[PDB]
């Protein structure tokens, strides 16, 4: 439960604090925690594995719709709407999280 | 578009050069991943994988080989180590950028991951190379070789080197095995063999074993430290052989086991015991060499000198047992094989002597008057020796004879001491043997009871001491001499005889006059209390008739066997007690009454097996064994009508070995006698098979 | 002069043993035969 | 509809520990007495920082082992009393 409590606190940092990293997938500047992102593997390789480490971040690629759900998942482990599924799968291929890929596949199977 | 992926691949590959080189910046990782991400989606991810492999190989060939070759002169290991660290670092970071390919295309194409691929390239272009590997292997051999000599070397470098080989081996360890592992084992092997050859010059067992044990610890350390455990296990086996197996028996005779046995060096033997405990058949060769010595020493003890004191003979063997028992307790750590070795050794030389049972029957000397606990342990040791003996029946007969003597003379320290010996005999023998001894005790209970009954009879009707003997239980001269008895004692014995006839119906009184003495008086200048055999008593009675009595003359009237009339030679004995020749007994020897004999105490007892006795006693043993097996064979032949000769002799000897080992050749003769006496009947199908005939 | 005193007579008394059956029990004991009417 | 969820992040917390082992992205460095780099994000979440988030941010080398370990994965009793953490309190009481 300690890891879960720590996790809850990490995202609560929801308090507009420690949001050193700023993701940009479509010109829009959304905020995120660099170290916390480096715990979840595109982000892991974005900073710790990144060479220009100077990303505190232009993801570009997929749209924010999918990325918003991707971020909504990496925080509090909660992903996936009927209108927001295929793009999330594509975004789940950019970020190394198969959970979202699996989730979208099951959702597509369902609908 | 193929040109688009080509251009984006070039950008990614140019950035890959950066990720691979020490400098790592000047680019946005996201772009790089995007390149790889799009390429995989554009069916060019595997194309990128091959290109990545190409630059990885190029780096490990152009930016590595030359660098480590510049260090062939010196610090090759350190330069190679640094290159390996740099390579591994480059592999993980390029992987953390080309991860998407491993995520899908690498597992799809069923190929290895970026890092795995990089390591394979390294163990093909750098490590495990045509020359670089050998340079590393030899320098590691040189490193451990100096470590073997004690030369302080950088064990960290050796450890890093071997560990690096393990990492290159990945899932397997073949890389290290085919790089330094196998060379190290053979190099260490000759290292120990040279050490053992150098030791062969010292020719001293103790220091050899001590430093060998130290070598085991020191060498195994050199391994678990910088050579890990993969090479340690083989070493534990290699060093043990190249250092000890070659001298498995050499160390035994090099100080030495027998040297330790002679000086009772239990501490040195303990080290040798442990040294060969970890050696296959190491204890075996030590045991057989020890048994060889124990055989020699025990045979020397068994070998008679003149004949040797039965007490000393048994005690010598008891002392021999105690020494090796302590050796097993300490040096051989109660090893079961060593125990079995010593046990068989004693069972061997002990039986070589047929007088061993007679000599052990030692027990009589102990029973014939240390504390009770010390005596108990002495009896126990003799019992342990009795266990080694196979002549159980012979010992029982010899002991029961001595027991009967002590019982008749009622001089045993305590019947309880006898009871204990009898109980111990029962544990190591049959109830038959015990019943004989038990019956002897019952007889004594009757004798003392009947004696008082006769005294009560004397009081009722208003110093004879009859000792009734139970038939069988007590062995007696096949033929009682039936000599005349002094009238007063004889008349009194007739009264006890008629008393016993009435008291015990269907029971006679065969007087064994030869057994028993009396308080005979004799003129001495005054009389004295002389303890003489009933035979010597009748002689003095003749002296009452005639002061001058000749050997033959006394026989003509006492009716005593000329040999037993012994009595006259003992009575004369040496003319103090009686004047006869001083000791030699002959017919022409006339005996004159002697009064010169004297003593401070009025009571003076008068002195009263040899080759003849021992011979007849052993013959009795043989005759008993003869009838014994004959009965046993018929008994089982009756139980199992059909019994094949070999089967019959096998089961018979097996069921009888407990008390004695029946000789099969004589068994067959007795078996043939049983065949003649109906019973065994040779079958037409197999004469060996015998059918029982009531 | 030489008169015997306190004579320790030793007389082996004898029947004046287990029957074949028992010989081939000890508890069993002896027209006298060792071990429903007397024969 | 069926928005599927998975709390496998419990490799988020694991990665932060490996990030610490890798000695990378250490936003802050704790001056034990000696220095020991740490991550304020975990520290603030594990114990309420108030301190780091309370701008107490001007101190890159904030001046101060059993606690930090537990976070990513006699004196401990005193530290737990000073900085109230129920899990550490229970663990030290059990020990």
Author numbering:
A (entry chain K): 31 to 43, 45 to 71, 73 to 84, 86 to 89, 91 to 113, 115 to 146
B (entry chain C): 26 to 279, 282 to 333, 335 to 389, 391 to 398, 403 to 495, 502 to 564, 588 to 627, 629 to 636, ...
C (entry chain R): 21 to 36, 51 to 58, 65 to 70, 77 to 81, 92 to 95
D (entry chain L): 24 to 33, 35 to 57, 59 to 73, 75, 77 to 83, 86 to 93, 102 to 110, 121 to 142
Paper text:
Among these, Cullin-RING E3 ubiquitin ligases (CRLs) stand out as multi-subunit complexes comprising the Cullin scaffold subunit, an adapter subunit, a substrate receptor subunit, as well as an E2-recruiting subunit RBX1/22,3. The ubiquitin ligase function of CRL3s is activated through dimerization. In contrast, the BTB-containing Kelch-like protein 22 (KLHL22) plays important roles in mitosis, T-cell activity and amino acid sensing. CRL3KLHL22 ubiquitylates several cellular substrates, including serine/threonine-protein kinase PLK1, programmed cell death protein 1 (PD1), and DEP domain-containing protein 5 (DEPDC5).
